[PDB]
Amino acid sequence: IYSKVLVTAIYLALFVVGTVGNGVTLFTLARKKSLQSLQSRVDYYLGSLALSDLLILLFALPVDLYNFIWVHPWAFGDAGCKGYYFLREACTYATALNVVSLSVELYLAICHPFKAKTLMSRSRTKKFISAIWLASALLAIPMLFTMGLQNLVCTPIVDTATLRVVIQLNTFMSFLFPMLVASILNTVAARRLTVMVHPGRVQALRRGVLVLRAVVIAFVVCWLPYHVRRLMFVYISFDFYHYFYMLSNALVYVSAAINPILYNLAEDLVEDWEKARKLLEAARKGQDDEVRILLANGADVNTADETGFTPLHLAAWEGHLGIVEVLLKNGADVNANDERGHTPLHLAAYTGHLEIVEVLLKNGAGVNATDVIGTAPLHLAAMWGHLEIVEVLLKNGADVNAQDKFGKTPFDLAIDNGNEDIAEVLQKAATRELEVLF
């Protein structure tokens, strides 16, 4: 009683946010104008898959929601009968060829960049996608002859042999072949790209491969069970099949409806990650030009790596004052900690960059700040033997006696590594503390 009503609520809900979701996606990518060519041609293939997803929701779902679900006689006529399975057939090819075409174009860009330069174009892609949608429609024409009305049911109008033949050809070159081709190229290209990686066009590639990875997986998730259902008709000849048929078909509508919401959601999340990742690399590498541009875009000043290394940790460690300066200018945290519990002041004192040590303190770095090891900036300056830094550290209220978990003072470490000059400074500095205390 409430079962049929339960599906209605879901199937109608999928139609609303699905039609709109894909609709919004089609208008979004239309107005979109990326400077990198690959970014555009990728989004033309995404826009092509959004149409395929939209057509399925507008034409097929209503026929399913009523005849297939709600009201178990055929009420759409032979024109609508042949049309339902035509459009549904046409969308599988359209989706399949796009998934392949995208992977081919994307593969070429990575593995044959110079060959691709002479071949690929926004113009040719935009045209070629029209040719896809034609071929998709032509390959779907057979299903017009393969279906008809009978006694009132839109049942097949050809032999089981000819029916088992078309589903075989359908499932082969509208799922099996494309998945196979996409999976091979998306693996060969990915391997090449991580090797090439180990800028604008290279950024578009990293995005493009990330997209195609998400596309193919999403494509395989929903269409596999659908094509598995089709495979049954070809080969197999108790009541689980009926349950599998309904779930496999329903999954297509769910995917088509949520994918635009997901893609839009995943984009923003990965965009946040990619911008943040870019800054960490840029700060460590010393490419100040990027860092300045990345900050304006809206990258998090207090991003952290797997270790817990923020831009200020990397910039101070590598010794890029220009970056350390602009990082603090864009509200970077001077007292930020990593895994071990090192502050930028630890790493600036470690490397020995005097100017950076001064700036960190001037912007309010913790001078006695201790890590889990028990070590402090003064220990690291004495350790490496930076006689200039120990001076400016001692100036800014540094605890000379402060010992670590190894029971060693900076004066001990200074004496240990036999930096005679630096060791004499701490002795005199320590004496002053006794007079100050007394």
Residues that bind ligand Q6N (CB under 6 A): 85, 156, 163, 229-230, 232-233, 236-238, 241-242, 244-245
- Count Cα atoms within 13 angstroms, Cβ side, for 104: 13
Alpha helices in 235-337 (DSSP H): 240-285, 288-297, 311-318, 321-329
CB 425 within 8 A of CB 393: no
Q: Smallest gap, in angstroms, from Cβ of residue 245 to ligand Q6N?
A: 4
> How far apart, in whole angstroms, are the C-alpha atoms of residue 103 and residue 41?
11
Q: Among all chains, which residue has been given the structure tokens 């870019």?
A: 278
Q: Which is nearer to ligand Q6N, 85 or 317 (CB)?
A: 85
The least CB distance from residue 157 to ligand Q6N, in Å, is 9
Which tokens sit at 327?
């990082």
Residue 135, classed as helix, strand or coil, is helix
Please report how close the Cβ of residue 262 comes to ligand Q6N at its closest, in angstroms: 26
Smallest gap from Cβ 240 to ligand Q6N, in A, equals 7
Q: Which uninterrupted H or E stretch holds 154?
A: strand 153-156
Smallest distance from ligand Q6N to CB 238, Å? 4
Task: Please write down the HEC assignment for all residues of 27-41.
Answer: HHHHHCCCCCHHHHH
Closer residue to ligand Q6N, CB minimum distance, 156 or 352? 156
Name residue 406's amino acid.
F
Which CB, 158 or 181, lies closer to ligand Q6N? 158
| Residue 234: CB minimum distance to ligand Q6N, A | 8
Task: Give the CA distances from residue 369 to residues 91, 155, 399, in Å, rounded to whole numbers and listed in that order.
Answer: 63, 79, 10
Cα gap 394→378, rounded to integer Å: 8
CB closer to ligand Q6N, 245 vs 384:
245
Task: Supply 193's token pair.
Answer: 């790209």
Taking the complex as a whole, the smallest distance from the CB of residue 164 to ligand Q6N amounts, in Å, to: 9
Cα R_g (the chain), whole angstroms: 32
Which amino acid makes up residue 414?
A: A
- Is the CB of 151 or the CB of 237 nearer to ligand Q6N? 237
113 vs 156 by CB, closer to ligand Q6N:
156
Decide whether 236 or 269 has the Cβ nearer to ligand Q6N.
236
* Residues across the chain: 438
For residues 128 and 134, give the distance between their C-alpha atoms in angstroms, rounded to a whole number.
10
